[PDB]
């Protein structure tokens, strides 16, 4: 940027905001992404200052512009979680956008932010009424996403499933046999939450996580479940079993149920697609050290799906 070394960052940011206002097409996102980089990474002390000017674009007619705003909210809260106090309302209204792509993007963002806010709540020594109300908002938004399992849009259902997956993992304890993705090493989980915490109740969360799981198992036996929703769910159950092996029992039961009762609304090629994924996820749970207690059952399913004996052995220890 010519004479960029002579600028204050706040001047650069104002210039760029006014430039973005001048642009009447999606190339404005390029500009707005420069602004994001500046006030989130280069000089985060300028975040609050300029927040409203970026959030104002939430009412742009462009789909992509609104998706960029959601992305910005995610990164802003990651940099300084206290901004959730004034951004949880914006995010929830974006969750109710008329365009499904914007809704799906808000769901993915909540998949990232629910666990960051919960850590915020847990690390806090003292909590304002405003902070309590923010947790209530986050928490009821989670419930709203769970209810999107019953949306009439297949893509919104898929995204809800991934949010529910994340929630179940967050709301249950890591154990000795958990396989934890490296990206997620420092994510909060149940065991991390003090039993005597002043505001967050361990047993409440535990019951909410189990109830999110039961919701998921219910949804998987819904009689019109789509090909894609069912494969998304089967994959999530495999993630859940690998990261939270106390549920492996539940997952194997789900797979047994599904194998014996394929939803009959699936077209021929959908049945095939689903069976291939069931096999794939079964092998995957097999490889997990905790599958020892389920090994005969998993083997029997695998044989019924035509898995060769040598392919089964290949996925043992």
């Amino acid at each position: 940027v010519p004479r960029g070394s002579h600028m204050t960052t706040s001047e650069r940011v104002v210039d760029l905001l006014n430039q973005a206002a001048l642009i009447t097409n999606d190339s404005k996102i390029t500009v707005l992404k420069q602004v994001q980089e500046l006030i989130i990474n280069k000089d985060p002390t300028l975040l609050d200052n300029f927040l409203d000017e970026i959030i104002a674009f939430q009412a742009d007619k462009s789909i992509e512009v609104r998706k960029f705003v959601i992305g910005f909210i995610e990164e802003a809260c990651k940099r300084d979680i206290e901004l959730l106090l004034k951004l949880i309302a914006n995010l929830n209204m974006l969750l109710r956008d008329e365009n499904v792509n914007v809704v799906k993007k808000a769901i993915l963002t909540m998949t990232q932010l629910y666990k960051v806010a919960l850590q915020w709540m847990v690390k806090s020594r003292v909590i304002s009424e405003l902070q309590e109300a923010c947790w209530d908002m986050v928490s009821a938004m989670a419930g709203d996403i769970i209810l999107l399992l019953d949306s009439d849009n297949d893509g919104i259902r898929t995204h809800a499933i991934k949010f529910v997956e994340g929630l179940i993992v967050t709301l249950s304890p890591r154990m000795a046999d958990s396989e934890i993705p490296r990206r997620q090493e420092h994510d909060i989980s149940l065991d991390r939450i003090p039993r005597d915490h002043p505001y967050i109740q361990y047993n409440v969360l535990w019951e909410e996580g189990k109830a999110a799981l039961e919701q998921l198992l219910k949804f998987m036996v819904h009689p019109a479940i789509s090909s894609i929703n069912l494969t998304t769910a089967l994959g999530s159950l495999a993630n859940i079993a690998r990261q939270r092996p106390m549920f492996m029992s539940e997952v194997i039961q789900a797979y047994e149920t599904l194998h014996a009762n394929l939803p009959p609304t699936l077209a021929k090629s959908q049945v095939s697609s689903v069976r291939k994924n069931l096999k794939l996820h079964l092998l995957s749970v097999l490889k997990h050290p905790a599958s020892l207690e389920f090994q005969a059952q998993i083997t029997t399913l695998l044989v019924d799906l035509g898995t060769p004996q040598a392919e089964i052995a290949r996925n043992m220890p």
Binding site: V100, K104, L108, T111, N153, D154, G155, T158, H159, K162, E165, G166, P181, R182, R183, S226, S227, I228, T231, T232, G235, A267, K268, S269, Q270, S272, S273, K276, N277, L280, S284
Partner: protein, 189 residues
């Protein structure tokens, strides 16, 4: 709409499709999932074999030294030339870093390899990508037919209000229209 077309050797089915889509204004990349590049030879049990690091031009040059006549007759020199004008070498899907809306595979073995590989990458984003298979035989004719069927499919997908909500329905219509089966799944970034 960002599409990836994936075959086994990244020589014939994927490049034919790469070519059509690209000329028709799509954003498209192509790959192969096979262990090595395979190319027809002087008998069906005598294919030529290469590494994925080998260039299209090196293959051409190799083939022209071996049997100029044969590799002109069977269209392979022409294919390599066509490939070279697209990009300098075949790419393994397993080494790619890129994001797509839609990934089309050209046979079931390939579809399995695409799914196996994406299912073993750690998801950071949970964004879905749709993976769809159509069986296309590995010869020039079918490759070309297959490219146009893929083109029509993508053009259709570009005309729907809501890709994710309509795609299964489109695929079942394409099944009825072509008598070819279309497997379909999602993976996650």
């Amino acid at each position: 709409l960002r599409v990836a077309v994936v075959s086994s050797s990244n020589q014939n089915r994927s490049m034919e499709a790469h070519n059509i889509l690209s000329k028709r204004g799509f954003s498209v990349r192509s790959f192969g999932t096979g262990t090595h590049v395979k190319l027809p030879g002087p008998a069906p049990d005598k294919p030529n074999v290469y590494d994925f690091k080998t260039t299209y031009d090196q293959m051409y040059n190799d083939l022209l030294r071996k049997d100029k006549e044969l590799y002109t007759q069977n269209g392979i020199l022409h294919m390599l030339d066509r490939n070279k004008r697209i990009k300098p070498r075949p790419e393994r899907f397993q080494n790619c870093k890129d994001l797509f809306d839609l990934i089309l595979t050209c046979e079931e073995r390939v579809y399995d390899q695409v799914v196996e590989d994406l299912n073993s990458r750690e998801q950071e984003t949970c964004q879905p990508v749709h993976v769809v298979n159509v069986d296309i035989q590995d010869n020039h004719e079918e490759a070309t037919l297959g490219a146009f069927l893929i083109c029509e499919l993508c053009q259709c997908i570009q005309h729907t209000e809501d890709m994710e909500n309509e795609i299964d329905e489109l695929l079942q219509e394409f099944e009825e229209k072509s008598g070819r089966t279309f497997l379909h799944t999602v993976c996650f970034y």
